[PDB]
Every structure is written in C-alpha cells, then in structure tokens.
Design a protein around this ligand. Structure first.
Ligand code: A1BSG
Ligand code: ZN
Length: 140
C-alpha cells in the first residue's frame, strides 16, 4: 500500500483504489496501473520534474529504503497477476531490487522529489510506475 499527496490530488496504484477514489476520480489509466482522485486537504509531497535514473525506494516487505539505479519509463511486458491479465504496462521503470505484491504504493524518490510508486516485481526486479510526466499534478 501507499499513495502520493500533492496539492489537492491523491495518486495511488489503480488496482488498490478505494470506492471514494473512484467517486472522486480525476484521471486513471489501466495500462499505467495509476489512478488520481481529488482531496479536501492539501498534500505535502513534491513531484520530481527531471530525468534522474538514481534514487531511493521504500520496500515494506523488508522495512528498508534501498538506493537504486532505474531504467527510463518504457512499455514493458508484465505477467498475469491477481489484478490484470498478461499485458504491456506503459511508463514503467525497472531496477534490481526486492518487490512483493503488497509493496505496491511504496515511493521512489530522487533529489527533486517523488519519481513514482512500486507497481511490479519478480525475478529480483522491482518496477515503478512513473508520475514525472503528469505536469498537471503541480497546478489547480
Ligand atoms: N502493475 C501490475 O500489473 C501489478 C498488479 C498487482 C500485482 O500483484 N502485480 C504483481 C506483482 C507486483 C509486485 C511484486 C510482485 C508481483 O508479482 C511477483 C512479485 C502486478
Ligand atoms: Zn530527479
């Protein structure tokens, strides 16, 4: 689990969104595994606006924050899971590291702010859904 809180927006993994998130939906994309909903209170997170390929992510299944090198956002084949059939997921970045399904939502951050959230894993790899291209998260 986990979310990003920026301005009056809440960013979560689409597969973990609640009834309230869908009722207050701003934008969602199944191919990215992302959903953004509106909030009443102001958030305190800052979204990175950069092309960084190094950062730190939180891994709940190890209670640890790991420094990682990660790939640029791309279209990557993701195996079938409990929440989606086998498909290509877009805007996905991979790193060598540990990930289990319940780790989804863990933040990846660089010196500029939040880069994305954990979304995939397996085979000693961890994948993150990028949010740095969602420029509208910085306004209204
Ligand atoms: N973005 C997706 O398609 C998600 C949907 C929910 C989900 O359980 N997975 C599989 C998954 C995620 C993280 C870690 C691991 C996983 O499988 C093995 C280790 C993929
Ligand atoms: Zn950065």
């Amino acid at each position: 689990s986990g979310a990003i809180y920026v301005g009056n927006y809440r960013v979560v993994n689409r597969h973990l969104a609640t009834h309230n998130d869908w009722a207050n939906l701003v934008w969602e994309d199944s191919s990215r595994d992302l959903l953004v909903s509106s909030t009443t209170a102001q958030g305190c997170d800052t979204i990175a606006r950069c092309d960084c390929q190094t950062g730190v992510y939180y891994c709940s299944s190890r209670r640890k924050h790991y420094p990682v090198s990660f790939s640029k956002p791309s279209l990557i084949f993701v195996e079938a899971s409990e929440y989606y059939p086998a498909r290509y997921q877009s805007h996905l970045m991979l790193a060598v590291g540990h990930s289990e399904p319940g780790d989804c939502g863990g933040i990846l951050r660089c010196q500029h702010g939040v880069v994305g959230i954990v979304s995939t894993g397996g085979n000693g790899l961890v994948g993150f859904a990028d949010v740095r291209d969602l420029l509208w998260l910085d306004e209204e």
